[PDB]
Design a protein around this ligand. Structure first.
Ligand code: HEM
Ligand code: HEM
Ligand code: NCA
Ligand code: NCA
Lengths: 191, 190
């Protein structure tokens, strides 16, 4: 059992529903074709997760203002916090590819948003860290999380055309999710 | 261009150049991207109309998106659509041609304000829906980025050149939408 991973058993119902999701999927051009290709992406990425995680953790670790969000008050990285989050982050890669984007998925999207936001940050792992991750950086991270995925999608010998379809599905899915995570950040009624 | 007030905004941006430096690092934007975004402008300048038609065609095909240009009776305000189109067209050029400096940041705050209820519908003096839900600005990062790709390949540049121009475009779009969250975000959570 992954500590803190509460998919399917969240405290709250999401403030967005399956009709909201339908319309947001339309805004990111996500269709049944992307459902298929995100699943195929999962098959390609599954045994590569550790190397993907090292790439993403390496990026954050190389910028003091980014590693900042995992630090103790003394400004040093909380290693227990980093490790605990890494397990759930790893599972998120699989979820994106393997879960149906249903109400349970949406409820967990709200949860992940709440956990980056001051509402729930630091509570899952019971750590003393910085209180909030500025929303500017969640949007910003759409780029690195999307673009640095591409070389991994090509590592199993798939053609550039099939890599392109898996990559676009990943881009769309990343964008869709960060959009949802904006909810706890955005003034009530403005989301 | 009616309503276009770049360099002449009545507010200073709440984010400064040090904020921009750090956000550029977050989207992996470097001097290389500075070069390639400028090169993208050279490629895209005389393609703006076809680019606009694609983006407008996407919005027009979805009632929940075209919604944001509608009059209270639910019918599209074509004057609103046309006036915005001119400033949207200029935005494409600005992204490629402006230094990302204080003037640029000031106008980034302005564009955010104009999507938000703070200033939406004031620039063109129209009556339309009061706010554009922030969910859709983030969402639009995908279509605004992805649909640009074919246009960057249309002037005979090499695949490596096209890819670099496209990555620069992706970074810049992401960067800008991040900034535009400011008026939407609960005070102190940005
Ligand atoms: C595309 C953007 C992002 C993605 C896909 C992402 C992914 C994730 C995931 C899957 C989790 C675990 C959720 C769970 O508890 O099950 C998480 C938590 C976390 N992430 Fe992110 N994240 C993003 C943006 C950011 C940014 C910009 C930072 C700043 C360094 C960051 C730092 C953190 C921290 C500190 C936690 C732990 C939060 C807590 O205390 O519960 N994330 N992220
Ligand atoms: C990547 C995301 C987006 C980009 C790059 C973008 C770009 C722009 C630009 C450049 C302008 C003109 C700014 C100026 O006044 O100089 C504008 C205004 C406008 N956009 Fe967007 N936009 C985005 C998201 C959206 C979305 C999701 C909608 C919903 C349909 C939308 C609808 C509008 C409307 C209605 C205006 C006029 C606002 C006003 O009354 O001032 N935009 N946009
Ligand atoms: N490195 C990252 O992008 C990251 C790691 C853990 C949680 N959220 C984001
Ligand atoms: N079509 C679009 O994405 C669009 C058009 C005008 C303003 N903002 C966004």
């Amino acid at each position: 059992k992954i500590p803190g991973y509460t998919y399917g058993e969240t405290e709250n119902r999401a403030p967005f529903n399956l009709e909201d999701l339908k319309l947001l999927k339309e805004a990111v051009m996500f269709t049944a074709e992307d459902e298929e290709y995100i699943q195929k992406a999962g098959e390609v990425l599954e045994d590569q997760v550790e190397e993907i995680l090292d790439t993403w953790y390496g990026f954050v670790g190389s910028h003091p203002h980014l590693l900042y969000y995992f630090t103790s008050p003394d400004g040093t990285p909380n290693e227990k916090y980093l490790a605990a989050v890494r397990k759930r982050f790893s599972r998120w890669i699989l979820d994106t590819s393997n879960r149906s984007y249903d109400q349970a998925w949406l409820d967990y999207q709200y949860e992940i948003g709440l956990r980056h936001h001051r509402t729930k940050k630091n509570q899952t792992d019971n750590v003393e860290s910085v209180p909030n991750i500025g929303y500017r950086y969640l949007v910003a991270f759409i780029y690195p999380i999307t673009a640095t995925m591409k070389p991994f999608l090509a590592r199993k010998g798939h053609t550039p055309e099939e890599v392109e379809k898996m990559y676009q599905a990943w881009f769309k899915a990343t964008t869709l999710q960060v959009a949802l995570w904006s909810y706890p950040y955005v003034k009530y009624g403005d989301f």
